[PDB]
Structures are given as structure tokens and as C-alpha cells.
């Protein structure tokens, strides 16, 4: 009687945390405005991911024909796709993005000085996410780790933290343009990292009496709904059900992962509501 | 397919025990009957909270815990005017002073449901006094009102007795006692969801007038299995959105067998990395 109620509530679920990528060379206003529409249906998801380049036309064009977009946040993604920028190059490109009217900014950490120096790496992380973070203000900034290009737990364990130093209010698995997306091993790292993070800033804040909200975004890229799922299992359990907010929990997919999304929370029948 | 089949279940039944709230309020109950459905509730992960009567909440808070460690960790809700919702305002606050003094966290109290079918009038008028005396002594705890949708006769008696109750001071609208067969929950669900949506609308007019508090909903599902369960959580969150799913605005409430079954399909889900 009640066949597909647990797909259905769990897609429910993901879709109050999605953010759908639409970063590839290949966007087009065409290709950015049939993932935005779907992205806005109600109920919305939290936003759309894109380059520079697509911010004005969903805010000042795509509006016009499509209000709906306006109920969705758009994250511009900056220091793509290499992480090749420097500091200032990077503001530049998170300012321009602001002024376009994005509401978020994503940025991708230099991973290739991350895998040749550690030291020299991090420091770079604390410098590029610092300038960034000045330029974005009370705005959130995601910081993209690329752990799948990071070469062992360590350096991702050290880029996250590093992340974290320069002022990331959200620590990202992976970009979304990737060979490799989140796994299991990474995931746990980040949450580690972060944990141990907060226990030591959380006990600063307490022992002086002072008295930020700090996220992960799960990257899955183009997995299906039921690999999604385990992500949000490990999620609760690393970090508890009180981290599945959005200030604090944010899940990165394709196009294909939301239409899934939505066409199995579509088939719940609400008839008697 | 062979591949992730319980992944959705296993979500879903993490989500539920998150909320659950455990009746053991039968007219067999004694100190070793309690204390097991307690010890099930405090495995890790902990539900919410039990629901007694007011005679096992010094058990449970001085005598269990000293064997059972554990069970300080959920919260212990103590039904009065129970079961048949026919006593005087003031005997009922006797008994929540009681109960709120042996150790209870919460009080459920049960509205005169009769009153309300034999005259709505009267009916809501006793229903706004019993509320207003009980809150005056439970204070800064919560005061869950239980309306007994099932046996009120008619959607016009069940809205009226919900906004008698949120006039009252309730802290919570409960569909049912715990004890007892259920019947219309979805309707009495979808009845109470709209007395709260435009009960919040006035309330926030009228404090502004002055120159609102956080209120939920608890669906009391009975002995139904984890698929009907889903479907009332999937009913809540269409109706209210993903914002009321949170533990000051929402409880499931249901009995030991339920409990068990939970967490038997969570146990299943391997968190070892
Ligand atoms: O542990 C008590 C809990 O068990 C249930 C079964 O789910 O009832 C059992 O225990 C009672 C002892 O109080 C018996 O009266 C009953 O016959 C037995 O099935 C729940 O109803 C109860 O809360
Ligand atoms: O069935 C309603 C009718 O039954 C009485 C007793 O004859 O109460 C019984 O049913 C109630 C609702 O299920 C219970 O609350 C009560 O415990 C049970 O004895 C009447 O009082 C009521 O009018």
C-alpha cells in the first residue's frame, strides 16, 4: 500500500539540500536555464553551481521568463577550473561574480602546491581563502578541497584545516567538473578535520566566555540516488542528526541526480493533501 | 536490482527514531515492563523520550538509572487526566506538579473530548482553562495537548478543540494518547496542521498589536508498521515543510513493537569505515 514511501522521503529529503552543477566548458544560457527551471520547481532546491560567466543571466535575464528563479541560490564557482589563480586574481573573479548577484561564492584550492609542499600548500590555502573571504563578507564561502587530486588522508586532513584557518564556511569534497567525487574515506576525513576543529574553537569560546556555523558539502557528481543516500547515512552518523540543516550540510550533484530526485518525489501520492 | 535495497529503509528508520517517543502506558504496566522499553529507547542511537503515567517517572529518574545509566539520556513525558480527559482543571495541575516533581521533562494532557462532542461551545471554553492552569504549572517545560482526534465527532469539533488548545498555551498538539486504538490520524494530522499554520499568522498580529513561541505537532501512529509511519512523516513534511521536521516542532509517537522494528532496519546499516 505504501510501496516506495522510503525512496520517496529520502529524495524529499536530498532535495532540501541539493545544490545541482551546471560548471561544464560546454554551458550554454540554454543548457544553465533547463537546469535552473528544474532546480526552482517547488519545492527548490537550495541552488544552482556555476561559472562566472552564467551569474547575470539567471539573475537579470533567466528572471524574466522564469520567476521561480529568484527562490534559488546561485553559488559562483571561482578559481576554476585548475586552482591555478593567485589571491587576488581570484577575489577579483568572486567580486565580479558578487556584483552579478551571486549569493555564494565556491572556491577551488591550489591541490597541485598541496601535493609537491604541505607547508608551502596550506599556507597558500590560509592566503587564497583569507582574500576571498574579505572580498565575500558575511556571504558563504565553500572551499573546494579536491580530494580526489590530493595525494593521501594527511594532505587532505591539512588542506581542510587549513581551510578552515583562512575562514571556509563550508569544507567542499570536490568541484563537480572532477574525474573523482566523494568517497566514504573522505568524507570521514573532512569530518574529522573539522570535528577536532571545532572542539578546540568551541573550547576557546567557552573557557574565555567570548559568547561561526561551518558546513560540509557532500560532492557526489553524476552517482545515483541510492550512493547519495549512503552519503547522507555517514553524515548523520559522523556528525549527527542536528548537522542536517542547511547552515551545515549542503549535497553537490548533476542534472541527472535532480531530475531522479524529483521524479521519484513526484510519484508520492499527495491526494489526500 | 541487487544492489543498495535497504539504503532508503535504513534512512528513513534513522530519521523516525530521531523523533520517536515510545508509549508504555497500559494498565499492565509495572516497574519491569517500563524499564525495558526504556533500556530499547536509551540504546545509542536514543529516541526522544518514553511516555508514562505519572506513577513510574521517580523509577525511571532515581531508581533505573542507577543500573541503566543510559536512560538520563531521553526525556520522560508524563501523561495526566489520563486516560479518559475528565478530570478538574485543578486536579490535573495536581497531578503534572507531581509528575514534574518525581523527574518528568514534559507533560502530555488530554483534553475532555466528550465535552467537545456533547457541546463545542462549553467544549472549548473548559479546554482553554485546563491548558492555561496545567501550562501556569509546568512553566518553561513542554505541555503536549492530546485531542483525542479520533474520537472527537467531525473536522469542525477537531479544529476547534486544536485552536482552544494553541490558545490555551499548548507548547504541542498530540493527535492521540498512546494508549487505545487510533483512528483518522492523517485527517486529524492534516486538520491540525492548518490550525497551527493560521493559529502562528494571528498570534504574530496580535503580539505586534501588543506593542510567537515554537509549537509542534505530534502524530501518535499507534501499532501501524514503519511503512505507514514513513507515509505520516512524508505528510508532515508536504504539509509543514522540511523546516517543521526538527525536534521542537515535531514527535512521532508509537509503541514498543515499532520501536524494536526501527531500530532492528537501522542496526542494519553499516557504519564501520
Ligand atoms: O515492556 C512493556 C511493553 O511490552 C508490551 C509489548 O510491546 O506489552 C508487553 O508487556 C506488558 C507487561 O506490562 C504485558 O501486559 C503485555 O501483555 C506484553 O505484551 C507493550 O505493550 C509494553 O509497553
Ligand atoms: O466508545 C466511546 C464510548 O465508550 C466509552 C465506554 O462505553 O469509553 C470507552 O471508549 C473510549 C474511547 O475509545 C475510551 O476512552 C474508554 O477508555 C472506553 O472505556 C464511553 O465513555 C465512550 O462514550
Not at 29 to 40: D, F, G, M, T, Y
Not at 149 to 160: F, T, V, Y
Not at 234 to 240: D, L, R, S, T
Not at 253 to 265: A, H, P, V
Amino acid at each position: 500500500y505504501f510501496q516506495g514511501i522510503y525512496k520517496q522521503f529520502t529524495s524529499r529529503t536530498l532535495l532540501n539540500f541539493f545544490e545541482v552543477a551546471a560548471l561544464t566548458d560546454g554551458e550554454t544560457n540554454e543548457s544553465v536555464a533547463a537546469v535552473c527551471k528544474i532546480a526552482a520547481k517547488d519545492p527548490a532546491i537550495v541552488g544552482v553551481s556555476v561559472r562566472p560567466a552564467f551569474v547575470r543571466f539567471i539573475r537579470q535575464e533567466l528572471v524574466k521568463s522564469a520567476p521561480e528563479v529568484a527562490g534559488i541560490k546561485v553559488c559562483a564557482a571561482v578559481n576554476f577550473p585548475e586552482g591555478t589563480g593567485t589571491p587576488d586574481t581570484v577575489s577579483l573573479e568572486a567580486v565580479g561574480a558578487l556584483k552579478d548577484g551571486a549569493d555564494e561564492i565556491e572556491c577551488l584550492i591550489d591541490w597541485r602546491r598541496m601535493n609537491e609542499n604541505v607547508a608551502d600548500g596550506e599556507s597558500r590555502i590560509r592566503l587564497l581563502v583569507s582574500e576571498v573571504k574579505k572580498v565575500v563578507g558575511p556571504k558563504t564561502l565553500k572551499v573546494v578541497l579536491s580530494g580526489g587530486e590530493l595525494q593521501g588522508g594527511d594532505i587532505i586532513s591539512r588542506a581542510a584545516v587549513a581551510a578552515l584557518e583562512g575562514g571556509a564556511d563550508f569544507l567542499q569534497t570536490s568541484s563537480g567538473l572532477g574525474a573523482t567525487h566523494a568517497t566514504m574515506f573522505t568524507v570521514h576525513l573532512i569530518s574529522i578535520a573539522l570535528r577536532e576543529y571545532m572542539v578546540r574553537e568551541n573550547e576557546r569560546i567557552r573557557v574565555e566566555g567570548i559568547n561561526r556555523c561551518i558546513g560540509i558539502k557532500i560532492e557526489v557528481g553524476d552517482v545515483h540516488m541510492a550512493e547519495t543516500a549512503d552519503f547522507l547515512m555517514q553524515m548523520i552518523f559522523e556528525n549527527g542528526p542536528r548537522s542536517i540543516v542547511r547552515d551545515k550540510f549542503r549535497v553537490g550533484g548533476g542534472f541527472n541526480l535532480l531530475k531522479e530526485l524529483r521524479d521519484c518525489y513526484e510519484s508520492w501520492d499527495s491526494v489526500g493533501v
